[PDB]
Amino acid sequence: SRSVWKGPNIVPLPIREAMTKGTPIRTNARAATILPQFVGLKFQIHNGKEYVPIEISEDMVGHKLGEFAPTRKRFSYTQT
Amino acid sequence: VYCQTRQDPIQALEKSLDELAPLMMTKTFNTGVAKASVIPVPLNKRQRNRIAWNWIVQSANQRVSSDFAVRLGEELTAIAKGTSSAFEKRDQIHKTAIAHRAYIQLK
Amino acid sequence: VVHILGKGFKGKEVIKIALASKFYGIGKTTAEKICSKLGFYPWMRMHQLSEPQIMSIASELSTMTIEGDARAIVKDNIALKRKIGSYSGMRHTLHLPVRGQHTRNNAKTARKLNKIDRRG
């Protein structure tokens, strides 16, 4: 849904109740434009096996939840 | 070609080809390898001119004009006057056949 | 042709694109009408530039954003997400497909240039 119109992505979220205590809401969905409306809280992002805990920033705007949650781990070496 | 020397260009080219194309050569047959013998090989018409034309395109990559279409004609005009290093080429080849005449497969 | 904007050029060199070449802040369309405002007959080479004219040329480039001045802007846009949690920042910092290309194989290119201050 990347366009001036149809902007942007609404992923149903407990943000409402979360906006109270701020409980890192396990937003497993990991696929939404960081909402530019509430823009501010903390939650863990399912990186395939584990949800990485992150909060909101002055950069995290259009950046999608996933862009901050790495999946595959780093590469390594040859044989020795 | 015609312009730089006003006489039939096709005929002149044919003459140049006849001059340049060696009439024979020397392939190097194996025969149980070991000491492969060099025996003179007869070259067909299209065979003869093929070698002559190469010695010319190769000589047309040493000119100046940025159009090979006509760097060809000047080389062709040059050959007419009697200026295509190829002549010597032919000479050596023939010579390498004079000797190695003995190896001729049959009289 | 001379020391135009310091790193100048050469004569015979039609100015239009010449600017797109030496200059980094300007190129293609930008350089095209850049001459248009300065109104220099197109297909015009550097040698023909009437020094005073170059003066206008210079000012013109000052007006918009040129030279490595923008190199940084991107450098920062890079550092931006990079400084945030950004797959790119890893891809960019590690020297790996920032465009998510062939990390497995064809990735030397990325390793060659992709880096914190990429445009080097």
Next chain:
Amino acid sequence: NFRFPIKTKLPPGFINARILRDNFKRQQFKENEILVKSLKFIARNMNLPTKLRLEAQLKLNALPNYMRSTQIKNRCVDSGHARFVLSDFRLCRYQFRENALKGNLPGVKKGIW
């Protein structure tokens, strides 16, 4: 209750678990396609107010996976294969050759031309 959320008849002929999943999606999307179209028109008509539109875009994201055709893959009706699936015979690179050569497919043989 039923394995699938909503009870569904079983595809006649060859039955496969992957076919059952795809068949389930086909049945569900077929009925939901009208709703899918209704709500998407809603969300995409700028001529509307943002909220009504948003409410809709959101419901869509919430709509179950079976309410989609992108999820339905062409699968051989006879062998339950979703690779190299010609849609003219709804078969596959083998069951076709087989049926075509055997003559099971009328007017379908070999391109000797």
Next chain:
RNA sequence: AAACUCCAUAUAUAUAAUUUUAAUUAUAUAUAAUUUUAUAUUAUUUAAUAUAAAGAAAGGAAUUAAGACAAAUCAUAAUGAUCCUUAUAAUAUGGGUAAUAGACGUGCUAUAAUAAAAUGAUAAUAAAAUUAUAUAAAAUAUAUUUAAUUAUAUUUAAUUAAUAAUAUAAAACAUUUUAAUUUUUAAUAUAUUUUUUUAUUAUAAAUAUGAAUUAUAAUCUGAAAUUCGAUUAUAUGAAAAAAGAAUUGCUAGUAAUACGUAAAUUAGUAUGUUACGGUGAAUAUUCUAACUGUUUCGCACUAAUCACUCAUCACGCGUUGAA
């Protein structure tokens, strides 16, 4: 095997009220050639080589035997045997198949003048193919000032197919350019080259090739392009100077083509697959080498030369000698 077969070719008949118009076609059918006739050399009763003369005469495809490689498939399917049934069975969400030190194979795009790019509206010129799980024409708006092109968005004309759409085929051809190239220009004059000439002064290895690549914005599809698609605009412009030993395809409408075209699989993306046509070649049979069928001779091999086989050394263990 060949032949029949399919495409394709020559002719002939039938069909099309020549508005589905391509009658230069489309098919259904029939014939046709695995060409024939004659003379002259050779040969030995009649074959080959040349010559003419009659015809249009020419290709491709499909079919790849028996066996062997215990070749590939238990993931097309199916089934034996064996292993699990609260998990090696079913479902949802997310992830993965896209990870990258190095290495290989196959492509694509490349490295500029016997070659690349704008442009060509009385639209130079095609075949094959698609379009009721749809193609989507004209225009209309923007990107952008005119206009065209290119890419998206608005509305759907017509066509469910010899009707309308994809789609004006492109290369070739013409003109204009084009770094290095000082082969340039631009200021003069110079003049029977004017798009040019000449005299003088000036004009200090990656380019205007290459688009890998990097930012930002924008657009498609679909809930959803973040790992992860596509497109464009503005930017960026690495590597690459025809590539070592070595090696690959192809013998004629083939190779080659910076010649395009279509389909299938797509909600969506082809540098791949399968088909179509346009332009269109040199080189050749004579050596070795390799693979095959026919044959010679040899053969101690026979799951067959990737066979088989020999002695020493080294290991461990018997027996029997010298002393």
Next chain:
RNA sequence: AUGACCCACCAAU
């Protein structure tokens, strides 16, 4: 199936 291995190429009458 028993069944981890194979090794040598040099130049003429």
